[PDB]
Amino acid sequence: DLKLPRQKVELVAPPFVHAHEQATKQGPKIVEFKLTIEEKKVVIDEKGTTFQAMTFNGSMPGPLMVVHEGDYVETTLVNPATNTMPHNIDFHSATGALGGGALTLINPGEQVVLRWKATKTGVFVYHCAPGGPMIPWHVVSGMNGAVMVLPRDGLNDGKGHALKYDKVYYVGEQDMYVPRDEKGNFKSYDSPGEAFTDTEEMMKKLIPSHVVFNGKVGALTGKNALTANVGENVLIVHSQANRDSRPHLIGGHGDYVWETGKFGNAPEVGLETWFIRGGSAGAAMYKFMQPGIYAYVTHNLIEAADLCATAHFKVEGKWNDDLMTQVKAPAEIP
Amino acid sequence: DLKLPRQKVELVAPPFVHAHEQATKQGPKIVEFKLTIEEKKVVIDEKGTTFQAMTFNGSMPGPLMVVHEGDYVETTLVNPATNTMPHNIDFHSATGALGGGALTLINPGEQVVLRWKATKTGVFVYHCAPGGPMIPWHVVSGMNGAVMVLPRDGLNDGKGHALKYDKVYYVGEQDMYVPRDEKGNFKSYDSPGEAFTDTEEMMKKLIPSHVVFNGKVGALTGKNALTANVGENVLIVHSQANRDSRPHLIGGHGDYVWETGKFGNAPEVGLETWFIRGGSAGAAMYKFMQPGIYAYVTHNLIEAADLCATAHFKVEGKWNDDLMTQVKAPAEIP
Amino acid sequence: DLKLPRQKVELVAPPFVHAHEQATKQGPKIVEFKLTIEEKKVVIDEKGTTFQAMTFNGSMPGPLMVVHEGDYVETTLVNPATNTMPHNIDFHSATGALGGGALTLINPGEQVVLRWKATKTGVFVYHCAPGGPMIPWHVVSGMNGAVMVLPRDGLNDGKGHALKYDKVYYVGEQDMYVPRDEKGNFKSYDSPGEAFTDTEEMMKKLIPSHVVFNGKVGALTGKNALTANVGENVLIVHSQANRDSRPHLIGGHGDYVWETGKFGNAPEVGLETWFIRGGSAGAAMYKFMQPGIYAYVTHNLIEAADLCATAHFKVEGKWNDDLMTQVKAPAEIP
Numbered sequence A, B, C: 001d002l003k004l005p006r007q008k009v010e011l012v013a014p015p016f017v018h019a020h021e022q023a024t025k026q027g028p029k030i031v032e033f034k035l036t037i038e039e040k041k042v043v044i045d046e047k048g049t050t051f052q053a054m055t056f057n058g059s060m061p062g063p064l065m066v067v068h069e070g071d072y073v074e075t076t077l078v079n080p081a082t083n084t085m086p087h088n089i090d091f092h093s094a095t096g097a098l099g100g101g102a103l104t105l106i107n108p109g110e111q112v113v114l115r116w117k118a119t120k121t122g123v124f125v126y127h128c129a130p131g132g133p134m135i136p137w138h139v140v141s142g143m144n145g146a147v148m149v150l151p152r153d154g155l156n157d158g159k160g161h162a163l164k165y166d167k168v169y170y171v172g173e174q175d176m177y178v179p180r181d182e183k184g185n186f187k188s189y190d191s192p193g194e195a196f197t198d199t200e201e202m203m204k205k206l207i208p209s210h211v212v213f214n215g216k217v218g219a220l221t222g223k224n225a226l227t228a229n230v231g232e233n234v235l236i237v238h239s240q241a242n243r244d245s246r247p248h249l250i251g252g253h254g255d256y257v258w259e260t261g262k263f264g265n266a267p268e269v270g271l272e273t274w275f276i277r278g279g280s281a282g283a284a285m286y287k288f289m290q291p292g293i294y295a296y297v298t299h300n301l302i303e304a305a306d307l308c309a310t311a312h313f314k315v316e317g318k319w320n321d322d323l324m325t326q327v328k329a330p331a332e333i334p
């Protein structure tokens, strides 16, 4: 009965984002996505700590889905028989049925197809939510991602001017709760079910052992640093499905920031640090002015430096001595 | 000397709100309220955990008081002789004398009458604040509520359009600190005074044992679910006198949100999750589009699902398949 | 090559702020500041608890630096040989080289001179950031302050009207992590290096032992209360380099608040409590209407009353009975 064109999207792993238009002359379509749930034991730090992860499409965060206002998002959610638990999906962008959660509960061996109309613009969390105490556990195990619903005319600054990004990255931040044994070492478990009792006990005390971007300490550093060039406008979408975060680009700013993440509201300008409320996504754009390394952090610096929540940008281009210069290099005090 | 008409209000227990006008053709009046303090041992969870509560009018939160800009709010605060402690009241809506606290300290057996002019619009916390370390203790024991100061022309969207709600609910969120004994069971106490030493020790560690709406786990579920119909615009006032919260309506949105709670500022639009700073009230309105059950939570999902901070809405009306539909019910993977 | 006039500033200790113009007819200048790092053991509470502090210019917070948009800020950072550790400086107001941190690392016995162009208006954090796990440790040891970059036309309300303050105060809030011994007493250490292992262990658990303004419990009370008169417009700049805060003026309001701290955005009006994201500064102005004592707090009241985060204002002037009056003093219940 819904007679619109269908478009398939090939999702890509974060922090990258599948190809899409900002402004578009397309009208509404049914945009088709597939998410396959994977439960897996992963390594989350450089010491080799393991973690019983539960993921959409194998990644933490789940991939960014991008559509336009008035599109219909049709998701095939697949829970292979190789998984152990039921799962579902709640889209904060969607209206009704607990975001879709009440229509998508699938046992191992099942799949389901949900369609929702993208009536609200912005960046939004999606996450699993199977019921009761399982809700936080599946979310903090990694089962969360985001979806971006763009205006058909692209982004604007609330003063009539278009804001076009040259690239977009998705940084998903994950609070993780890994219990310790008596002597103080992190515990390893054979299954998510086996990890549950100790992990819930820790969860209820509200202090994570790790806070990471893209699923691991250091994920977005070295070979996998984010990149830009001087003169490039970069959009950084940041999500946190369970706990607050305060993003900050060290050596830069948020030129235009939607900290609550919703494009019906004008962006704020010229921020140092912004705030992602737990259960939300927000977005910040910045035009790089200087080359070199930047760190992108949550500005609880204990979390950033000690618990895992640091990414890098490596930026190419020409240094601008008008903006900053070392007038006198380090020298002995006279 | 103040020669205005007097109007009595009969307060009602949360989450309901006493009858009031949004837009009004009344001019300023002296609006008369009575709050009677009650210290009492209550049950706060489905396991039968007890808690030494201290309340305005017997409830957590204290009732919502509603007036209009330029009204004078005249409160008779009563501390019956059956209570054990001194108490007072600080209105964040008021100007001077620590919000009224410096003019309202009453021993058991006393009452006091305070008047303040409602010069600031919005939703505001009120709470007890007797001095020193007693301040946090009385607040986290339950002695907090809110007051709404409406513009005389009612609410607007900051773009010239009236925003009229069909109903309003007040959700007061309470962080509670219940100590445990050596074997890990919650402790019970014979009096607030007896609970104080153990409770303060826990308080200073900044992790609540319970986070509840309307005073108890499950208070706003089952028979006492919040209700609406498709097409109804519902205002949800949310307060937290001591600790941050991040409200979220699962399956809905905040169509118009004043997260800082103050009507001199335009609302933000189309939010997924909003943020109530500890020590404040905020407000969100939503027009329901779909029938069914919704959950209203703080979106720290550990707090929501595990510590008590979940309410339900039951919504009547016709399902809208354009907004959401289950294209294919759960089935075996091909 | 940069041929502008040079102006020296004599910094003053917080909460006071060096003399400056709001609106100015001066054009851009090179504004010269000197910061001398001091590592020192200090007393942080009325019980005599000691703390291994690391400071810019001897104070926590470091002093407020005030310039105008388009000025060049030239800082001589000095690390005397009497210190033990390397240090540097990151300005959130600056563009490039990790805010200056990558250009300012100095060993004991060295100094460095950094210049940055003040292209972003607002209040901004500055802090030390020597690398890795040292970053949070130096910040939570006290090595943070703020810089205010004013529009050349002064502040405005976003509706065309000037906002001129009669005085400005800088409240720097510091989360401190002081370990305890087995019997529960705070530990003392002979050096910052000796304090590091125990202090890091505690830091990673994300619960401070103390949260203070101006470096000590009670710093901004008694002789050192903040002051005002009825009719005076006071700007309160609040910073927190590592952890969120929720300022509140008990008995007052935020008449105009930039909670994200950036003057390119209009202020919000009529707030009760505002929110300083960790890693940022914000600012609130209030015109006092009533005499008497006010408390200025973070409205986690446990932190305010029990962990140290309370300042006072003493305000002179005439009481306004229209705004507030005690209709009936405390009396026996009829």
Ligand SMILES: OC[C@H]1O[C@@](CO)(O[C@H]2O[C@H](CO)[C@@H](O)[C@H](O)[C@H]2O)[C@@H](O)[C@@H]1O
Pocket (backbone or CB within 6 Å): A151, A156, A157, A158, A159, A160, A263, A264, A265, A266, A267
């Ligand atoms: O940036 C959103 C903000 O901008 C305003 C103009 O101040 O509206 C603009 O953006 C709307 C949503 O994209 C457009 O529909 C509108 O035409 C455009 O002016 C605000 O109304 C809005 O809050």
Ligand SMILES: OC[C@H]1O[C@@](CO)(O[C@H]2O[C@H](CO)[C@@H](O)[C@H](O)[C@H]2O)[C@@H](O)[C@@H]1O
Pocket (backbone or CB within 6 Å): B151, B156, B157, B158, B159, B160, B263, B264, B265, B266, B267
């Ligand atoms: O919603 C408050 C927001 O709306 C504006 C118009 O953009 O003012 C409106 O609301 C005021 C307060 O109710 C009215 O007095 C005013 O007349 C009306 O236009 C903003 O000024 C305000 O921030």
Ligand SMILES: OC[C@H]1O[C@@](CO)(O[C@H]2O[C@H](CO)[C@@H](O)[C@H](O)[C@H]2O)[C@@H](O)[C@@H]1O
Pocket (backbone or CB within 6 Å): C151, C156, C157, C158, C159, C160, C263, C264, C265, C266, C267
């Ligand atoms: O208060 C900042 C806010 O005000 C507006 C007007 O609504 O611009 C004013 O402030 C700018 C920055 O100081 C001035 O350049 C501008 O001329 C003045 O109108 C907004 O554009 C801005 O967000």
Ligand SMILES: O=N[O-]
Pocket (backbone or CB within 6 Å): A180, A181, A182
């Ligand atoms: O050693 N088990 O906690």
Ligand SMILES: O=N[O-]
Pocket (backbone or CB within 6 Å): A248, A250, A251, A301, C090, C099, C129
């Ligand atoms: O500047 N950030 O640590």
Ligand SMILES: O=N[O-]
Pocket (backbone or CB within 6 Å): A330, A331, A332, A333
């Ligand atoms: O290298 N000292 O001047």
Ligand SMILES: O=N[O-]
Pocket (backbone or CB within 6 Å): B180, B181, B182
């Ligand atoms: O058993 N008392 O903590």
Ligand SMILES: O=N[O-]
Pocket (backbone or CB within 6 Å): A090, A099, A129, B248, B250, B251, B301
């Ligand atoms: O969608 N909320 O868990």
Ligand SMILES: O=N[O-]
Pocket (backbone or CB within 6 Å): B330, B331, B332, B333
């Ligand atoms: O029910 N299985 O297709």
Ligand SMILES: O=N[O-]
Pocket (backbone or CB within 6 Å): C180, C181, C182
């Ligand atoms: O007594 N040392 O922790």
Ligand SMILES: O=N[O-]
Pocket (backbone or CB within 6 Å): B090, B099, B129, C248, C250, C251, C301
């Ligand atoms: O009103 N403040 O506690």
Ligand SMILES: O=N[O-]
Pocket (backbone or CB within 6 Å): C330, C331, C332, C333
């Ligand atoms: O002092 N009693 O009315």
Ligand SMILES: [Cu+2]
Pocket (backbone or CB within 6 Å): A054, A086, A087, A088, A128, A129, A130, A138, A143
């Ligand atoms: Cu799941």
Ligand SMILES: [Cu+2]
Pocket (backbone or CB within 6 Å): A090, A092, A125, A127, A279, B248, B250, B299
């Ligand atoms: Cu959710």
Ligand SMILES: [Cu+2]
Pocket (backbone or CB within 6 Å): B054, B086, B087, B088, B128, B129, B130, B138, B143
């Ligand atoms: Cu009390």
Ligand SMILES: [Cu+2]
Pocket (backbone or CB within 6 Å): B090, B092, B125, B127, B279, C248, C250, C299
């Ligand atoms: Cu208060």
